Paper text:
After several rounds of 3D classification, we identified five distinct conformational states of the E6AP/E6 complex and resolved the structures of these five conformations at resolutions ranging from 2.6 to 4.4 Å. We therefore assigned the five conformations into one of two classes: attached (Att) or detached (Det). In all three Att conformations, the catalytic C-lobe of E6AP attaches to E6, whereas, in the two Det conformations, there are no interactions between the C-lobe and E6. We hereafter refer to the three Att conformations as Att1, Att2 and Att3 based on the distance between the tips of the two towers in a descending sequence: 74 Å in Att1, 71 Å in Att2, and 66 Å in Att3. Following the same nomenclature, the Det two conformations are referred to as Det1 (76 Å) and Det2 (61 Å). (2) When the two towers leant beyond a threshold, the Att conformation changed into a Det conformation. As the two towers underwent an outwards rotation, the Det2 conformation transformed into the Det1 conformation. Accompanying the E6AP/E6 complex conformational changes, there is substantial variation in the spatial relationship between the E6 from one protomer and the catalytic C-lobe of E6AP of the other protomer: far away (Det1), close (Det2), or in contact (Att). Since the interactions between the C-lobe and E6 do not exist in the Det conformations, these interactions are likely to be dispensable in terms of the dimerization of the E6AP/E6 protomer. Unlike the N-lobe of E6AP, which is restricted by strong interactions with its N-terminal region, the C-lobe in the Det conformation is free to move around and accept ubiquitin from an E2; this is evident in the overlay structure of the HECT/E2–ubiquitin complex presented in Supplementary Fig. 14a.
Human protein E6AP/UBE3A, the founding member of the HECT-type ubiquitin ligase family, was originally identified as an associated partner of the viral oncoprotein E6 of human papillomaviruses (HPVs). The E6 oncoprotein from high-risk HPV types hijacks the ligase activity of the host E6AP to ubiquitinate the tumor suppressor p5313, leading to the aberrant p53 degradation. The HECT-type E3 ligases have a characteristic C-terminal HECT domain consisting of an N-lobe and a C-lobe that are responsible for E2 binding and ubiquitin acceptance, respectively. Here, by using cryogenic electronic microscopy, we reveal that the structures of full-length E6AP and E6AP/E6 complex are monomer and dimer of E6AP/E6 protomer, respectively.
Residue numbers in the entry:
A (entry chain B), B (entry chain D): 12 to 30, 35 to 146
C (entry chain A), D (entry chain C): 125 to 158, 161 to 169, 231 to 364, 369 to 385, 387 to 474, 476 to 563, 570 to 668, 679 to 685, ...
Amino acid sequence: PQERPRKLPQLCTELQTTILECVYCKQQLLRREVYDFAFRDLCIVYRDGNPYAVCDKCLKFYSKISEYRHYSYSLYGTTLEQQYNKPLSDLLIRCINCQKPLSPEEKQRHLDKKQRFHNIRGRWTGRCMSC
Amino acid sequence: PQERPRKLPQLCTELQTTILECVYCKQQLLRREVYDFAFRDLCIVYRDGNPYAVCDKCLKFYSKISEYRHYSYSLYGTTLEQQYNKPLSDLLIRCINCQKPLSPEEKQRHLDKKQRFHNIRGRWTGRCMSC
Amino acid sequence: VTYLTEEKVYEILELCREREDYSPLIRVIGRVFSEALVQSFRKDVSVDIDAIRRVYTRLLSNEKIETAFLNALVYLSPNVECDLTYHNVYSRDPNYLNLFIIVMENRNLHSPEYLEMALPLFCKAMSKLPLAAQGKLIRLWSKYNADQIRRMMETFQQLITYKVISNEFNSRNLVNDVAASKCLKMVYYANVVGEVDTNHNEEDDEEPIPESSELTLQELLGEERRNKKGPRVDPLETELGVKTLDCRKPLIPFEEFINEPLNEVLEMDKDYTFFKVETENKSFMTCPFILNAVTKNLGLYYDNRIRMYSERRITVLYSLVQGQQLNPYLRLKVRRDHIIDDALVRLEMIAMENPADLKKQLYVEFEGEQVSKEFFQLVVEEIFNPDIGMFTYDESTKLFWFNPSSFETEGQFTLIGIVLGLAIYNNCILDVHFPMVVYRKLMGKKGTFRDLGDSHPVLYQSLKDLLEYTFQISQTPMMYDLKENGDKIPITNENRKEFVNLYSDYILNKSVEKQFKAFRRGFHMVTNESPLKYLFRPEEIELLICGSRNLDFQALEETTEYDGGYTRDSVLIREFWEIVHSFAAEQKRLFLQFTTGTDRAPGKLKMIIAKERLPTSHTAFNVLLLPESSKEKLKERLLKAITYA
Amino acid sequence: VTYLTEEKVYEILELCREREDYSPLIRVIGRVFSEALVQSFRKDVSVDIDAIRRVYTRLLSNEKIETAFLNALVYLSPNVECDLTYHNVYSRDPNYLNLFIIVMENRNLHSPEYLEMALPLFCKAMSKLPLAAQGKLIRLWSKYNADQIRRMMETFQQLITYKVISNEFNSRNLVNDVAASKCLKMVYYANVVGEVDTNHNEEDDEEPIPESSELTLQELLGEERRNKKGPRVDPLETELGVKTLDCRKPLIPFEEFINEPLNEVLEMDKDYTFFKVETENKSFMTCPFILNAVTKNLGLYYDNRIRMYSERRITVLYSLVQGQQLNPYLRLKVRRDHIIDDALVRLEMIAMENPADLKKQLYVEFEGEQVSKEFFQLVVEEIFNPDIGMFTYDESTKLFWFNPSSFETEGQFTLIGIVLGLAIYNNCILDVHFPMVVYRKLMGKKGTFRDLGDSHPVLYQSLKDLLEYTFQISQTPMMYDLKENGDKIPITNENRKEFVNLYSDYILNKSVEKQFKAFRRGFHMVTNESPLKYLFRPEEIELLICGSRNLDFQALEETTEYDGGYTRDSVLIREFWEIVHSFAAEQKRLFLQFTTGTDRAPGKLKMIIAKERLPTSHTAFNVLLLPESSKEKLKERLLKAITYA
Ligand SMILES: [Zn+2]
Ligand SMILES: [Zn+2]
Ligand SMILES: [Zn+2]
Ligand SMILES: [Zn+2]
């Protein structure tokens, strides 16, 4: 639970390996999908103790799953800092396309496009540098 | 050729029947699909002498085939009568969604929506009353 | 002196008592009108509405004071409108809000000169006024009495009459040209508190059982924190704590807070994406108190319709990449006499396996039949008959209720909650006649006392005559002391207060704390994303669900949508409206059971047609696609579809 | 008198010769400026440019005449701008167009006071000016000589310098705030004719073999009439008959008719949907002469990219309803040494079975390999080597040509035309070095004489020295008399004129009337919907296909698009641009064969990167996603990918 490393940056250590299996594709992953799990910072999926990862084809799908379904509301730049008054660096915002946690510099992806930030599943999202 | 009735309003006569087979569905059609072939006024499909019809599921598809592919250009109401100078009643315009030949009253479907008329496959189209 | 006040105004008429001239005497009120009331009114705001009622009542004689009362406003408009979003004056201090009483306090704002003057500059000041400096004036505003409400209920309304019709607005000017909407957004709350109590709500609206695809995605994220921290709550009452969740009473009702010349002319279609998606330009959905209920439903229908579009946008993605089966509709399977079982367990496959597909538009299939709008009245007749045992009836009032002994068929309330949740998605009425307390409870407010006369009037006076006058009441034959030792309690009347409360908490909550909740579990499963707690009042959810009896046959003769054989001057079309308008006291009430299938009206009601031609209807679209003959053929053919009910 | 004219202006200086004062003398030219030249100029328009050159040259002394020359314009602006689209003055008569010479005839419009005055009112008059009353003034305007062109080529251009930069335009003001674009739309054609002849074009661009689904849909419609009656032709030249299809010569070139301060600042992305779809609001694509070729390609790339989007919008619809296989890319299969066969016959399955999928974006697959941008240079090296036998070389000029004895491998020109048609779709260059005559012929203009010096300069002077001076020339060893009995014709020079024409019609047309045509059949198959005849000049199609050698490494160090391990201050990023900018005479020419794979530049060129780390490139995106070390490690690693060419 608290012991099992929910980040592959910590699971590369506890596998006692050197710098990868996803449960969606049910297959063995690659080193392109160890950088982005360290970069999208997703949680390690567990199968009643059996830890697995995501693959990018199933990062681009199973987050596409929720974002067209679990949609709640999208708000202007004038409000997302107003009604929160929480720092944008502290503001836990990931990406809506690739689930990458937004750097605050990359929080001008909607603040500096005269755009709006999105919230899926009660967990706010948006566009990133790759999108 | 010139003898074979390219309209089912004439093929109901030459079948010597009373008020239906399509080659796309390869099946036997219905009286809902004899009114609209008299109303969309499509040509009777021939199989080297074997005359067949369209079904509406294949009117809504095989015209959806061309309209997203054989697209040429769409123009304002200010021009489609300008560069033609052809009467809108004489203007052979069918529908882009259901391939119904537009009544000139129904040629306000884009003239009186501040909209534009479309041309697929070099054969102009647009929206109709059903759409 | 800069600020003119109670004793300086005490001698204004006295200083012109001997010379009868008043030229700089009225300039100063056009000077003190431009923050200067604060030192002019103090001894957390001023209380000088009596004081101006010493001014204006001693200055009843000079009706030239209304000149600079109004002439000050023309420069007072850009005074207080720029400093709030560019200079942000009340951000640092809570003392900028003290000025605002000067505009509303005038007793003659009801006159049309002050109509186009007094509100829209001040609503512009109230627009960028913050959450407290709007919301805490309301705490001062609710303290006003009903006659003061009666003087206020017109005076903010009177601009909302005529400003909204000065705009003959297109689809380009919805919210930006309306501005005193945001005024009325606030001063609606004046009539909210000026009974409301946040105490007697429901328990928490528990979340849906998660999507098993998202359940594994819940192992790709934190699984513990962002469990619906935002259901997109209303923000004004988070600046209050006290809500529109629980408006038990007004002083003057909320239909006063609706404008129908506003309602039609607006753009409401994209207003849900002016609500869920944010747009400052064009919004009125963000003020859901002001919409008419027959127009409020549209965006609620649209939130489903957009979700149906989004479910149309997600139905691809398992025939897309997984290549599997495609459900572009919510396909439900029943039998016409094996429904209640098979209606349920198909949706249970849409519960434990596909808990997404329920917001997607219902398309019913059967087993024997080789259709949805009529289908609800099929459902809610057998549902709302006591053949299942879920339900009683208060047939005297003709108001409907659960049966408290539906202890096992609350597993069959599991259907109807989805069904009621689906009855609101397609925008169909139900001939459900539930009382108002259902809809307070559907909006998460547990049973008060006063809602009993909605549900059971025979209990209503029989529980308040106790107040007008032992402490236990039976329930159906089971006597039950609410308060412990409520048997031995005499007809001493001090105890009886909770006996009002507890037996009202019994039959409305402590009987059906699981019955309605197992019902509401099915309801809120498919209606969580719908903003019905946001948009609909509990009274609005009534007239949505139960429908209005304004049978206007004279609508769909003008807004029919027929094609394929029914042009405008069709012969039977020029022979049919004279049939539906040849009606008497009963021909009206039998019309709608054949066309749509209901008894009460949902002006967006429409029709459809094409080409013994009896009355036929494709009964999922109000589509009477019957043939072309004359009247006297068709004079009974409509009855023949209706006679064999 | 109302209209002042040649003999009334003969004594204007004489009537103030004795009194030296000219106050109403200049009011009248500010009166005759507001249609009044017509009676003032006549003896189908006036010829009085000599006459104003008697005015202005005798009124060289009074430079106050330029006051009311310009001061008349300020009221002349709304005079002639309202009457054309509200009153439509020249619709009935062809005599409203006679006025228009007064604005252009002034010799001092090049000065900036007349810049912001003389054009934009008159271009507004020229804007709603009709197809003839623009297009027939051009017939009068082409009669102007080169010095008159030299006086005109600046004076309409000089506003297009500064009016387009007065707008610091956003994505809201592209065409509506530009207006003298439509002026320049016309007066570009002044330099078209003022050689052009519509005679020597190609035969008709035959249609694609139809889609077999549309072929049955061609039995659902008429199959005989609307066979591409609109390829969306240019409308101005249909009001002429004489086209921009065939601009053989200018008097001053068409790069004068380009503005680069215009080019960047505009919106060109939706300009194709301001061209294919029509929008009067925001257009410049409808004036394709004015775009820079490195910007013109974008919309041409976008017309493919939108068709690729539309092919992305049509790839669903057979895995949607037919449920069959899904090609969301144009998947092409080859082998690295079995290409030319298998490159072709896969596309033949995309010809006789799926003639839609070729506009869809190419994604190459192989057999052994388990990529497209590099893939063309793989194709066009083996294609453009004579190992196949399609091709010669004029290696002296280094210009490339067909081999006329490719009588059977014109079946292998079938590939390259699709390939060249695909080389323009992905926006890649080719290192094809074809002459200009290919691109005249690619724009449907058969070979003139003068294009021979593009193709074969050794034939060029050896065919015009005949003019500077028997009537048959060999072709490779086969002598062939063009004119019959061209053997016996002496060096008499009267016959020789057609001998220029026919041998130029031989090697450019009568040799390759099927070779290029079987080549162009593959080209126009996939490029019919592309507006390359519309947008691209034949010179523009050159620099699209053959590419420009403006190797600007100092672009993509500023506009790189890297992510996933390459942030702005990356260490190797702060160590790499100093490597590419440490270049000498040869290090430049070897750079691009590794990154993209070419030798010449297509400022929208970009880069990509992520994280013996030698030079690596994902060679379909210019994606050098190499690792993080220092300079002196990487000092040869770039060479190591490039040394083994
Ligand atoms: Zn996976
Ligand atoms: Zn992304
Ligand atoms: Zn068919
Ligand atoms: Zn249609």
